[PDB]
């Protein structure tokens, strides 16, 4: 300020809530005790696919922009929509999310700026950083090596998928959530039809909602196979 | 193979100027494909992100084969020969030759098999709307969109068909705007977000007509076919917020005024505003609206002008730049700005019309 | 302290617009010294170098004062405000008041004593000319100027008058451009060098009309007296080098060709040049030119074209923008080249009239 | 080459000596960065006779007996040694730096340890493990620099003994009481 911005409000049902903590009791402990005030620390967070790691991400933005706190988020899958140039000044913000870090393997352009804005949350206070990725940050091939020592300079996590028993609960604890109600048997038949993809599945709740409040039926077996 | 093609003049230009347009950034990028497939020429021009391609009939005698040619240099040549001229090109080694009549030109080519071919992908929501409606829907939106924000998705513009609508929708984090217009056919609900260089490049293709506009979203491309000109641009993948979670819900205080002297109010009060901040401060009260500003200098401008308003009386300062911005896309007569309080976002539309909605936040 | 005066808007637009122009680099020297003598405004801008002052008729009650006020914020009030409206400006305090209207406008201020003023010189040669015959002088040699160089003596264009006609010449140590028009009476020899920023500044003062074009040229300052604006400016305190020893002496070499032609053969040749560089080499035979060009890329241009040439054959390489420059300056019909061997000056004229000439160096 | 004196410290700061409560999220993450082979930055910090320089030497024992280097640094006795002793230990496993407040105001001192937080950071496998008074922000350094290093990390209050815990903790030595019960650095010493 000045000025103010614009309340807008994007996709929040990803935040803790809508997050199911098995297996990751362990780094969801630490996770909340940086966001802690004051509490400044780094922890990288590495899985495989679909294991939620934008999705803490986006649950940590949340957790401190619905207190006044200043957040940012950098999706380095989506860098071909902005600029190295976006990092300058985040040093003074209370978490900076860097999604996907391994995106940057061989970009010399993109790893002097990560590495400049990591030394310049070190030379300050204040400042929570978040990174996920694909390995860890030894397995994780930078061209410069300062920048991978400091990667590795934190607490790391491996993050843990659900299982496919969490996965339909997952699903039901998005219908509560949103309003709607998803029942037990059309759950366990998007896990079978869709093959488990919970990038999709949560992403079709919106389309199979969505048809069923303009009409507006219950979600039964049928009625799924009408919308698709 | 061995590409040989012979067309007037006047069937390339305007073609290659519409492949050929501001667009660095790697070599074969900026270079056209050119291809003579019997009995057309396909003239093509990517930049990685998007597309754009040009069919040209030949008439005269010709043999298929493919290449690529710098767009710069090739349509210079093109436009300086004179009116009416013949064009021959053929390959020669690895280079183009361009002869017409005493003039040879031989230009440095690049291998056709090296050229960024867009992956054809599966259309789905499919339409036909005249130039001069998506051009409006454009010019509505467009200056509210962002420029390289770590937001990618308020990079561009929200296209959005709903029913017998299609909407776009643009904001910044600091200002929104939301146009809408009709259609003859009914059409399936969907969104896409078009990056801003395709938002450009898809403005700059609307000439005068008269041809429609073939209209082609897909799951995550969009393509745009008017005249022989095919478009083709991927989609920003990502979330764009909710405008009518944003728009003002329930405000108490409406004010119409004339947009024309509300235009060059603020005009002149800018002229004495911050240099970096713009910022103005807007005093609504009985019928009447105040707006002062003031720079580091000390130099303090007033403007007082007759409004019909009579809600309570308010204080609220703003950014000049983003208000103008609103009047000059109002084309119209009179606005009417709804307003709640000073630390809340003001919704600015035309007084006639509610085709399409402003929102700007105020400053502190 | 005491200065205040009511007019038009639009009597203060075209004065100020004058006033206002392309002028960093002083505190005082962006503001317009404003004074009021019974019963005229008096509107002033400089820059140490030059100056301009418009005289504006006050028909209504004013009272005698002076003061100084930012140009382009002064300028763009008045330009803001409605048509027909009328402008009050006083002195209150150290800042200067505008109002029209319900529209108040406070100025920070400078005082009028630290104004730069002129040294009134005394005249010598003075003569009046048509603003036509002085937009031609100019346009037909300002390109040949010089930019910031050690020779500053050519940073400028030489007006010079010597009889019964006045003549500008301008070179920048490449290419040389004179011009030389005549007027209605006779006049004693005289040569002065006018600024690069004068010549500027000469030519934007010019109008339609229909006022004839008063011009003072003095030992160390030229004044053009056009309309109720009196433009002066310092001279180059140098010494011009002399454009006749300039001009290739005997040439064995004619060559007639289309000017149109011409211009746009070289502008195509110039496509494929050197970025930096811009070598095209010309090689005049048997009622022929062959313009070929390349570059880096060992992209090739051949240019070939039918002109009227009887000389000896020879390749002579040139800066085609300066060819191009010249063959802009003459927009005519038919164009003569006049020239010696590959390493000497060529001599560019126009077929029709020998009013204006053109000499232009080749390149190795 | 070449081989080490057996010397063994004549205490019992063992971590099977220590007791958990109600430090028991300190010993979990404490335990966790001592695995090999990624190492990190705990701060702990507490008032008085809390057990701080019992984990460090716990810490140091713990890998210690597993052929691991280590090193310990009493920076209460800096008056013994010179800041040129923490060169070469960022090639060790484990860094333990007792009452880092004590250094407030010693530039000489603030400096060495500020070198030697880079020279681990630059490398990697070298835990490092700082107690002190008061947490790191409270620390009275003459480097801004340092101190938001010693503020990067992962920082824990540690929690001194009840009378009822401090009560089976002696009893625990024994093995390895109210008569003299509160000063635990002489209740252990009184054993
Ligand atoms: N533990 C969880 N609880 C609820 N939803 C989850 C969980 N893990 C993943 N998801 C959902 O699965 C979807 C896929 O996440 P994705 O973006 O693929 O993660 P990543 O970025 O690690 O690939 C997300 O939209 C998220 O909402
Ligand atoms: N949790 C505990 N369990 C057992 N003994 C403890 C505990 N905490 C402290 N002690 C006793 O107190 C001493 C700890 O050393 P101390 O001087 O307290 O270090 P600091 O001054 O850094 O706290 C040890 O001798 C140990 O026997
Ligand atoms: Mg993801
Ligand atoms: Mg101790």
Redesign the interface.
């Known amino acids: 300020?000045?000025?103010?911005?614009?309340?807008?409000?994007?996709?929040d049902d990803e935040t803790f809530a809508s997050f199911w903590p098995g297996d990751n009791s362990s780094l969801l402990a630490?996770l909340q005790?940086?966001l802690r005030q004051?509490?400044?620390?780094?922890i990288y967070l590495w899985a495989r696919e679909g294991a939620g790691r934008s999705h803490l991400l986006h649950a940590a933005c949340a957790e401190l922009s619905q207190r006044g706190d200043a957040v940012?988020?950098?999706?380095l899958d989506?860098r071909?929509?902005?600029?190295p140039e976006?990092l300058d000044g985040m040093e003074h913000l209370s978490l900076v999310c860097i999604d996907n870090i391994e995106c940057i393997a061989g970009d010399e352009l993109w790893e002097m700026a990560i590495f400049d804005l990591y030394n310049r949350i070190?030379?300050?206070?204040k400042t929570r950083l978040l990174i996920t990725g694909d390995r860890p940050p030894?397995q994780l091939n930078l061209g410069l090596p300062?920048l991978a020592?400091?990667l590795?300079?934190?607490?790391?996590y491996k993050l843990q998928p659900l299982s496919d028993e969490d996965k339909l609960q997952a699903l039901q604890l998005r219908a509560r959530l949103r309003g709607f109600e998803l029942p037990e048997d059309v759950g366990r038949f998007l896990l079978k039809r869709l093959d488990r993809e919970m990038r999709t599945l949560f992403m079709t709740l919106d389309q199979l909602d969505r048809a069923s409040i303009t009409a507006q039926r219950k979600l039964t077996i049928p009625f799924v196979k009408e919308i698709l | 193979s061995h590409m040989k093609f012979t067309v007037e003049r006047e069937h390339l230009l305007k073609p290659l100027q519409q492949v050929s347009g501001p667009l660095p950034t790697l070599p074969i990028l900026g270079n056209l494909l050119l291809q003579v497939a019997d009995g057309t020429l396909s003239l093509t021009g990517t930049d990685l992100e998007m597309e754009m391609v040009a069919r040209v009939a030949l008439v005269q005698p010709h043999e298929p084969g493919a290449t690529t040619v710098p767009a710069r240099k090739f349509f210079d040549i093109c436009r300086g020969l004179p009116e009416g001229a013949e064009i021959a090109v053929q390959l020669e080694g690895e280079r183009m030759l361009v002869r017409s009549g005493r003039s040879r030109f031989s230009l440095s080519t690049l291998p056709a098999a090296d050229f960024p071919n867009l992956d054809d992908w599966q259309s789905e929501v499919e339409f036909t709307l005249p130039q001069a409606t998506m051009k409006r829907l454009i010019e509505a939106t467009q200056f509210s969109m962002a420029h390289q924000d770590v937001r990618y998705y308020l990079n561009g513009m929200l296209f959005e068909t709903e029913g017998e609508e299609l909407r776009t929708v643009a904001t910044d984090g600091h200002r929104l705007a939301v146009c809408s217009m009709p259609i003859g056919q009914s059409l399936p609900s969907h969104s896409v977000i078009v990056p801003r260089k395709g938002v450009i490049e898809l403005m700059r293709m609307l000439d005068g007509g008269d041809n429609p506009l073939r209209v082609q979203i897909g799951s995550n491309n969009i393509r745009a076919h008017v005249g022989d000109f095919i478009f083709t641009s991927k989609l920003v993948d990502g979330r764009f917020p909710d405008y009518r979670r944003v728009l003002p819900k329930n405000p108490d205080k409406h004010l119409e005024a004339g947009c024309d002297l509300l235009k060059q109010a603020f005009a002149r009060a800018a002229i004495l505003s911050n240099e970096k901040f713009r910022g103005v401060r807007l005093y609504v009260s009985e019928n009447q609206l105040k707006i002062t500003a003031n720079n580091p200098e000390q130099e303090e401008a007033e403007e007082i002008l007759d409004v019909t308003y009579s809600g309570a009386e308010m204080e609220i300062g703003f950014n000049v730049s983003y208000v103008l911005d609103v009047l000059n896309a109002l084309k119209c007569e009179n606005v009417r700005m709804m307003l709640t309080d000073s630390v809340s976002s003001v919704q600015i539309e035309d007084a006639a019309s509610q085709s399409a909605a402003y929102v700007v936040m105020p400053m502190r």
């Open positions: 300020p000045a000025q103010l911005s614009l309340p807008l409000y994007l996709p630490a005790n940086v004051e509490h400044s620390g780094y940012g988020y950098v999706p989506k071909t929509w902005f600029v976006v070190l030379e300050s206070g030894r300062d020592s400091r590795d300079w934190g607490q790391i």
